[PDB]
Paper text:
To counter complement-mediated clearance, African trypanosomes have a cell surface receptor, ISG65, which binds to C3b and which decreases the rate of trypanosome clearance in an infection model. African trypanosomes replicate within infected mammals where they are exposed to the complement system. This system centres around complement C3, which is present in a soluble form in serum but becomes covalently deposited onto the surfaces of pathogens after proteolytic cleavage to C3b. The complement system involves a complex set of molecular cascades. These come together at the conversion of serum complement C3 into C3b and the deposition of C3b on a pathogen surface through the formation of a thioester bond between the TED domain of C3b and cell surface components. We reveal through cryogenic electron microscopy that ISG65 has two distinct binding sites for C3b, only one of which is available in C3 and C3d.
To provide a full molecular model of ISG65 bound to C3b we used cryogenic electron microscopy. We prepared ISG65-C3b complex in the presence of fluorinated octyl maltoside, which improved particle distribution in grids while avoiding dissociation of the complex. To improve the resolution of the region containing the binding site, local refinement was performed using a mask covering ISG65 and the TED and CUB domains of C3b, resulting in a volume at 3.4 Å resolution. The first of these, interface 1, matches that previously identified through our crystallographic analysis, with no significant differences between the models in this region. While our previous structure did not have interpretable electron density for loops L2 and L3, perhaps due to their disorder, or due to proteolysis during crystallisation, most of L2 and parts of L3 were ordered and resolved in our cryogenic electron microscopy-derived volume. In particular, L2 directly contacts the CUB domain of C3b, with an electrostatic interaction centered around C3b residue Arg954. The presence of this additional contact between ISG65 and C3b, which is not present between ISG65 and the TED domain alone, explains the differences in affinity of ISG65 for C3, C3b, and C3d. When we fitted the same model into the volume derived from C3b alone, the correlation was 0.76, indicating that the ISG65-bound conformation of C3b is equivalent to the free conformation of C3b. Indeed, we find that the binding sites on C3b and C3d for complement receptors 2 and 3 overlap with that of ISG65.
Author numbering:
A (entry chain A): 23 to 569, 574 to 664
B (entry chain B): 754 to 1371, 1382 to 1514
C (entry chain C): 25 to 170, 179 to 233, 249 to 313
Write the structure that this text describes.
């Protein structure tokens, strides 16, 4: 008997081209399919309707695209969510699923020409309107300039349909304003629940003539290092030449929001040839906190405050290097990227992530598993190393411990971490499993990724699996879907997946198969793998000189990028960033926003086939009752 | 052999940000990339510009380019280190820093400060403040200038320089924000509360905001008054809804004869309706709705089997039609209209049959075939005023089906009006609480419930919370639900809370035998309460301001949907004005004023004390500096900046002696510098006592003679709070150290 | 509209009477007239509805399925007797239709008359010192300027620069719902009894100009109420025949014997 099923994201976004994939396992001949979306629980309005046909030429698999209009009925009446009953009619059979709907349908990025302003100056800022795919979108957005006390001083409403997603704006700071961290808040009129904001400081200042860089020698303090923390003060004029002067350096211990300053650490050093060196002796650090015990300092972060004064005395600059962790191990191991569920009796792949205490990925640091130190792996440029370990068919929690094994460190300095991986529950205790695996290189667009489909299951039914269905989720949407063929007696097959720029920043590949197993029940076995693609502009944009300049000179500036794109420029004196370098717009933040807005928040398979899809963000519904548990929270657990 | 002053163009454009421009790429692509060339003009600032480019494409989305850095540079230039702001009449010193970055060339530089009427300085319209200096290669020199601002607002300071034997020159014209001799301060003019219904009169409230005192306001100073019309939304208490899990047993498959089918289907219909209204499906499980709807559809199909030819209904086809059963079926289907696809023909035919065949001319409905299951009719099980109860029940059903079958049955309004008239003609004579409640709901459905009718309806309530009547408590619950529905119809929300509280406290979640009518009615009433009960105190304030400075009546409106918004107004004037508020709601009108108040105490030089003096040595002079820290402890580390007067330089030996001191440190850079050109000096102090005057002194003597000697300056401050410095001036002749000026009536004339 | 010398200061009873006048006039203007017109026209509605029901019953007796739809049990003699009774009932009901229609038509214009009269009597309650008020509102607002009125509570309106308008809510009159012609007439009589007399040619008092409209309202409202009575009377006549028509239909649908059917009508 045919098994009709539909797969769609478990969160739908208003006014967006959400994609849904339909399939007819074991179907014969063409089958017309009708997709309808109704309000829930009303079931009164047909927000959308689509139709298509599944044919053998397409392997009885096809996608349907629909966009639910942003009807005014969708409101946070009392904070409750809203739902829509996706309903698909496979000829006579009807398959329907209730899917959560999220109103927030895009992002707003706010760029201010400067990070700090003086009273009476004009705040020039832009708002970028982009849907969840980061493409330009025309919608009505309203922005509020917020006083530090929280009073909205200026309120505007604008529509971006006349521009290619950029909304220039301005505001003149009154001379009588109050100082502090002013805020700009903006949100689409259709989703007041989500407000995007950016902070710009208002302060009285004069641009400094040079920048001061405080660079610790090792970007951390090893609590047993008797040499003490060594810091190099580097000062140079903004126009490139080196500084000469005197610098005052004071160290302090920070624990959470609280700060302690070590008065004994205050040292005066001469800055010659633009650089100078200062040392925070361990004795001073210990005595500054009443010397309770060496270990008591672990976990607390030092900070260095440096003030540089030119020998002419005409200028002064203050710079701080906060967050210099005090650690006993030079490395930290994170399991944030590993799957927390394992397939018994099959290899388990750990994407152990080891980083320096400051959070920067570590490079070429060996890692190993306790009890199996014979096998070791080295981190890639992104700090992720892959470790494979066999597992027994035990159906019991698996405890795994990894240890950095760098040659130059003592055993006590090696970082370590532990985690538990729960067994993957198999329907009907049929011990049928699917396992995806990828060779974790520094993946970048333009490469070909060989995804391996490893199948373990009883020989009595091996011939019934003749294709694996797979889906690729990116930015919370089905980027692609397709089927990989398999032959009987072929336990492993490789899918030569080609990667375009669309896959940036990461894509969660989900795969599964289905069969009529023991007792004729309909078994569905699914697995997921999370793959990271190096972050970069999906397009490109390079600014370079088209030809040093003297003041007032004409300069030919060359801009090269995507054809037909709208380019918005801004020039800022570097002196501004000396005073305040926070809240700068950068491509990394854009990807950070996208990643934090992903609908699935697990790196791999779940407890069962339902968990696999739910964790990846996909719903799966079938004629034979196979379903994923309902999702009722926009922010996923914890 | 020097560039004339007039010929030196002056750099004046120093924007901190520029090139705020939008460019669209349109050139023919090459290899999928298009290039655009821009001819930008670099501003006059000598710094490293950072150019950040963001591009948006309809296909490639957003992209942020790696910032590009342009380093504007020049072999020789001057940088003016002007403070952000200065006081209207406080003598201040500014430093012009000359840079010579020529790898191996020493420069003789003529530097002068141009005269501005806005500033008092050594420069005058008759003679310019010239000065000849020498700058070693790859070095810097600072020439101090003493100026006294004289006019508020932005003022421009211009400095020009030229190099002997070279065609190299530079000149800078920056701007200072001269401010009055005061400190910004804010005062709360008034903080009122707007509440027309409670604090106003006749529905309106008038407030008058007195003009701010501002006795300390400095003359000719800008002032601003800010008005905030903050709304204060007030939440309204709302009783909790029935927990979803309690309803788990209501959903049941319908079955049995025409009567039993109603028994089975009605709890499912009412449970589904309640869940839809309260939106409890999330906890109940979103999937179960499909099964519930399928069961409802099955029940409807089964019920249609018993539809008699005349569109009526009965327990069996052969049995005569029952008026009550038909009315109940109409009620249930009307509830199911928005759940499943019911044939409007069946409902309208039943309504038409009821109106035409089962209503007396006077308007009374009559029942001739009592229902088989007497427990079904709930509170009608025992009746004395049966006519009135049955008429009210039928009228409720007809009113519910009105909007569906009004167009199809033209006679319906007449029947409804006749029934209402009959009810009014006898409402006063009712005895049972159940009958009173049901008839009250029937009347309220058409707005006839008023005056003595409403008085009797409310009076019958036991304990002002329930229409109890001794007997089976299910009948009491049914009557209370009817009364609650009537009250919700009347909008009397001040009486509902106790009734809903009593209903919830009864903790009744439906049941089986003899629980159909009670379950249906109680759940419908609770759903209606959740739908219609107000969760927020009404907030529709309409407010206005009458400002004499304003030519028109400014106004604003605040609704519950916009209460949180902090609507505000700004005024650049100090005056009394009147604020008028109307409508329901609440709001905290707040008015504050900002201004520059005359100084209360030493506005500057509070942390430190300076005692600079200069005396002839036993030309040469002995400069003596004494310092103290006004505080509880010694200063951690202080910078003692000294600016020598024109033509005087410190004695090398004395500096070496001081540098060789215990608590004082002087950079090797200064000691190595030649005797001449050491016009600026810095002495670093490890500590300065707070209980005593720490003093130092060293010889200073002329290396060059000039017509007029600009006063020297001394500045002291801790290494971390330069803004909290103290400064002093010294001069061999003008003992005070201040430039001559006549401040008639607090307006100072240079001299 | 304008003040004049009077006989005495306005006692609290006089203010209460004036407020009663104003309240009754306003209620008549808003609700009572509309209610009367609607209930009058409803009689003409009901009489026609009963004609329609009679026609429907006759069609059931004779028509496409007279011999199948329940009535089939009737024999020809029963058919004839039922026809006789139904025709008699039809004649009786028809005899009353023109009276009800005439009453409704009269009430139609009487409603406009009373509405206009009462609204004019009530007044608009405008700010007199800028725009003169009207009717009993004019009287209440402009009477007790400030020693001519002792024992009153005045409105606290911010528009009361130089006005002492009586606050009617403070008079404490009962909110009785009797709004008949006598209701206005009785209160009018009370005012006259307590109304201070106009001095021939001392305390001041307000002119009685408003009485022109108010007194008229009583006249018309009496007529409107009379029309309602006329229609109501017609409505009563129809029930005598209509109930007979309904009873016979009920018995036959129960398949009861003719003797009961004839007896039930009689």
């Amino acid at each position: 008997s045919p098994m009709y099923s539909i797969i769609t994201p478990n969160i739908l976004r208003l006014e967006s081209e959400e994609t849904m994939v339909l399939e007819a396992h074991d179907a014969q001949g063409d089958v017309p399919v009708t997709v309808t979306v109704h309000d829930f629980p009303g079931k009164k309005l047909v927000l959308s309707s689509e139709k298509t046909v599944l044919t053998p030429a397409t392997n009885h698999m096809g996608n349907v695209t629909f966009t639910i209009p942003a009807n005014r009925e969708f409101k946070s009446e009392k904070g409750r969510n809203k739902f829509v009953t996706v309903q698909a009619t496979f000829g006579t059979q009807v398959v329907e699923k209730v899917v959560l709907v999220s109103l927030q349908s895009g992002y707003l990025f706010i760029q201010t020409d400067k990070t700090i302003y003086t009273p009476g100056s004009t705040v020039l800022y832009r708002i970028f309107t982009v849907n969840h795919k980061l493409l330009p979108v025309g919608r009505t957005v309203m922005v509020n300039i917020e006083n530090p006390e929280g009073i909205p001083v200026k309120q505007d409403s604008l529509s971006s349909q006349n521009q290619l997603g950029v909304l220039p704006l301005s505001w003149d700071i009154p001379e009588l304003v109050n100082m502090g961290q002013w805020k700009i808040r903006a949100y689409y009129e259709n989703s007041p629940q989500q407000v995007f904001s950016t902070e710009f400081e208002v302060k009285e200042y004069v641009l400094p003539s040079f920048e001061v860089i405080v660079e610790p020698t090792e970007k951390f303090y090893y609590i047993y290092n008797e040499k003490g923390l060594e810091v190099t003060i580097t000062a140079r004029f903004l126009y490139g030449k080196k500084v000469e002067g005197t610098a005052f350096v004071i160290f302090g211990i920070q624990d959470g929001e609280q700060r302690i300053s070590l008065p004994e650490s205050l040292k005066r050093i001469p800055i010659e040839d633009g650089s100078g060196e200062v040392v925070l002796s361990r004795k001073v650090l210990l005595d500054g906190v009443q010397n309770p015990r060496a270990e008591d300092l672990v976990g607390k972060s030092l900070y260095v405050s440096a003030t540089v004064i030119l020998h002419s005395g005409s200028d002064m600059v203050q710079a701080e290097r906060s967050g210099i962790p005090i650690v006993t191990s030079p490395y930290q191991i994170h399991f944030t990227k590993t799957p927390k569920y394992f397939k018994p009796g099959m290899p388990f792949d750990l994407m152990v992530f080891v980083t320096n205490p400051d959070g920067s990925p570590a490079y070429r640091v060996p890692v190993a598993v306790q009890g199996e130190d014979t096998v070791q792996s080295l981190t890639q440029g992104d700090g992720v190393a892959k470790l494979s370990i066999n597992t027994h068919p035990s159906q019991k929690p698996l405890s795994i411990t990894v240890r950095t094994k760098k040659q130059e460190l003592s055993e006590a300095e090696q970082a370590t971490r532990t985690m538990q991986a729960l067994p993957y529950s198999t329907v009907g205790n049929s011990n049928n499993y699917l396992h995806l695996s990828v060779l974790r290189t520094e993946l970048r667009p333009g490469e070909t990724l060989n995804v391996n489909f490893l199948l373990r299951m009883d020989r009595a039914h091996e011939a019934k699996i003749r294709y694996y269905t797979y889906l690729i989720m990116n930015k919370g949407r089905l980027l692609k879907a397709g089927r990989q063929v398999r032959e009987p007696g072929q336990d492993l097959v490789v899918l030569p997946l080609s990667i375009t720029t669309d896959f940036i920043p990461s894509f969660r590949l989900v795969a599964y198969y289905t069969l009529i197993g023991a007792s004729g029940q309909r078994e569905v076995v699914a697995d997921s793998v999370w793959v990271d693609v190096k972050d970069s502009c999906v397009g490109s944009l390079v600014v370079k000189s088209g030809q040093q300049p003297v003041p007032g000179q004409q300069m030919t500036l060359k801009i090269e990028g995507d054809h037909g794109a709208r380019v918005v420029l801004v020039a800022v004196d570097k002196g501004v960033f000396v005073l305040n370098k926070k809240n700068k717009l950068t491509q990394s933040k854009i990807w950070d926003v996208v990643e934090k807005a992903d609908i699935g928040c697990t790196p791999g398979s779940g407890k069962d086939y339902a968990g696999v899809f739910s964790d990846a963000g996909l719903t799966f519904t079938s004629s034979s009752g196979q379903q994923t548990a309902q999702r009722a929270e926009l922010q996923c657990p914890q | 052999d020097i560039i004339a002053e007039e010929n030196i163009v002056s750099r004046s454009e120093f924007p901190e940000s520029w090139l705020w421009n939008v460019e669209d790429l349109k050139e023919p692509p090459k290899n999928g990339i298009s290039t655009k060339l821009m001819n930008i003009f670099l501003k006059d600032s000598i710094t490293t510009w950072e150019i950040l480019a963001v591009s948006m494409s309809d296909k490639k989305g957003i992209c942020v380019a790696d910032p590009f850095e342009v380093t504007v540079m020049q072999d020789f230039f001057i940088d003016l280190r002007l403070p952000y702001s200065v006081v209207r009449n406080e003598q201040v010193e500014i430093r012009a820093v000359l840079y010579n970055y020529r790898q191996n060339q020493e420069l003789k530089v003529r530097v002068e400060l141009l005269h501005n009427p806005a500033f008092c300085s050594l420069a005058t319209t008759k003679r310019r403040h010239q000065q000849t200096v020498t700058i070693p290669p790859k070095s810097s020199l600072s020439v101090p200038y003493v100026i006294v601002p004289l006019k508020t607002g932005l003022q421009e300071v211009e400095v020009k320089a030229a190099v002997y034997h070279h065609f190299i020159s530079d000149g800078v014209r920056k701007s200072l924000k001269v401010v009055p001799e005061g400190i910004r301060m804010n005062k709360t003019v008034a903080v009122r509360t707007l509440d027309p219904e409670r604090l106003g009169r006749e529905g309106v409230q008038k407030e008058d905001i007195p003009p701010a005192d501002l006795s300390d306001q400095v003359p000719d100073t800008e002032s601003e008054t800010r008005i905030l019309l903050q709304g204060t939304p007030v939440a309204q208490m709302t009783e909790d809804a029935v927990d979803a899990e309690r309803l788990k047993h209501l959903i049941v498959t319908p079955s049995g004869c025409g009567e039993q089918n109603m028994i089975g289907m009605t709890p499912t219909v009412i449970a589904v309706h309640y869940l839809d209204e309260t939106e409890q499906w999330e906890k109940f499980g979103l999937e179960k709705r499909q099964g519930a709807l399928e069961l409802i559809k099955k029940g409807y199909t089964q019920q249609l089997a018993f539809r008699q030819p005349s569109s009526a209904f009965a327990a069996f086809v052969k049995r005569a039609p029952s008026t009550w059963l038909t009315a109940y079926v109409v009620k249930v289907f009307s509830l199911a209209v928005n759940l499943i696809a019911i044939d409007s023909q069946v409902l309208c035919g039943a309504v038409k049959w009821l109106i035409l065949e089962k209503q007396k001319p006077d308007g009374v409905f009559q029942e001739d075939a009592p229902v088989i299951h007497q427990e079904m009719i709930g509170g009608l099980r025992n009746n004395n005023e049966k006519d009135m109860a049955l008429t009210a029940f039928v009228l409720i059903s007809l009113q519910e089906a009105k909007d569906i079958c009004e167009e199809q049955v033209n006679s319906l309004p007449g029947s409804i009006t006749k029934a209402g008239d009959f009810l009014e003609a006898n409402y006063m004579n009712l005895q049972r609480s159940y009958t009173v409640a049901i008839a009250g709901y029937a009347l309220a459905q058409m707005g006839r419930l008023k005056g003595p009718l409403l008085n009797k309806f409310l009076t019958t309530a036991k304990d002002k919370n329930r229409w109890e009547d001794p007997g089976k408590q299910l009948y009491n619950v049914e009557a209370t639900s009817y009364a609650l529905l009537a009250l919700l119809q009347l909008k009397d929300f001040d009486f509902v809370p106790p009734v809903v509280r009593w209903l919830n406290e009864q903790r009744y979640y439906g049941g089986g035998y003899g629980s159909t009518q009670a379950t249906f009615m109680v759940f419908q009433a609770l759903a209606q309460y959740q739908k219609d009960a107000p969760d927020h105190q009404e907030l529709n304030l309409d407010v206005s301001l009458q400002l004499p400075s304003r030519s028109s009546k400014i106004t604003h409106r605040i609704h519950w949907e916009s209460a949180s918004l902090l609507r505000s107004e700004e005024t650049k004037e100090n005056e009394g004005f009147t604020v008028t508020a109307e409508g329901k709601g609440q709001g905290t009108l707040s008015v504050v004023t900002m201004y520059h108040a005359k100084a209360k105490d030493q506005l500057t030089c509070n942390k430190f004390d300076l005692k600079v003096t200069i005396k002839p040595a036993p030309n040469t002079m002995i400069l003596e500096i004494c310092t103290r820290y006004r505080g509880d402890q010694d200063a951690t580390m202080s910078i003692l900046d000294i600016s020598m007067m024109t033509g005087f330089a410190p004695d090398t030996d004395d500096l070496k002696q001081l540098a060789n001191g215990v608590d004082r440190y002087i950079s090797k850079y200064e000691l190595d510098k030649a005797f001449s050109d050491r016009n600026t000096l810095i002495i670093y102090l490890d500590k300065v006592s707070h209980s005593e005057d720490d003093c130092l002194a060293f010889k200073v003597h002329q290396y060059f003679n000039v017509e007029l000697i600009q006063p020297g300056a001394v500045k002291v401050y801790a290494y971390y709070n330069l803004e909290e410095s103290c400064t002093r001036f010294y001069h061999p002749e003008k003992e005070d150290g201040k430039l001559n000026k006549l401040c008639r009536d607090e307006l100072c004339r240079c001299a | 509209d304008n003040r004049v010398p009077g006989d005495k200061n306005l006692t609290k009873e006089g203010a209460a009477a004036l407020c009663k006048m104003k309240h009754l006039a306003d209620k008549v203007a808003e609700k009572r007239s509309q209610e009367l017109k609607d209930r009058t026209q409803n009689f003409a509605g009901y009489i026609e509805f009963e004609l329609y029901r009679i026609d429907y019953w006759l069609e059931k007796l004779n028509g496409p399925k007279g011999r199948k739809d329940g009535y089939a049990k009737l024999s020809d003699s029963d058919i004839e007797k039922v026809k006789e009774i139904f025709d008699k009932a039809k004649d009786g009901i028809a005899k009353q239709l023109p009276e009800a229609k005439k009453a409704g038509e009269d009430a139609e214009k009487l409603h406009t008359e009373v509405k206009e009269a009462a609204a004019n009597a009530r007044g608009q309650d405008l700010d007199d010192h800028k725009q003169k008020s009207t009717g009993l509102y004019r009287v209440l607002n402009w009477y007790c300027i400030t020693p001519n009125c002792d024992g009153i509570q005045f409105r606290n309106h911010y528009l009361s620069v130089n006005r002492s308008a009586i606050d009617c809510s403070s008079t404490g009159y009962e909110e009785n719902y009797d709004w008949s012609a006598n209701a206005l007439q009785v209160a009018l009589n009370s005012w006259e009894n307590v109304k201070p007399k106009k001095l021939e040619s001392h305390p001041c008092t307000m002119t009685e100009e408003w009485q022109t409209h108010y007194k008229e309202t009583v006249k018309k409202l009496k007529e409107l109420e009379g029309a309602h009575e006329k229609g109501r009377r017609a409505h009563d006549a129809m029930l005598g025949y209509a109930n007979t028509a309904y009873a016979v239909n009920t018995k036959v649908e129960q398949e009861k014997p003719l003797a009961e059917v004839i007896a039930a009508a009689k």
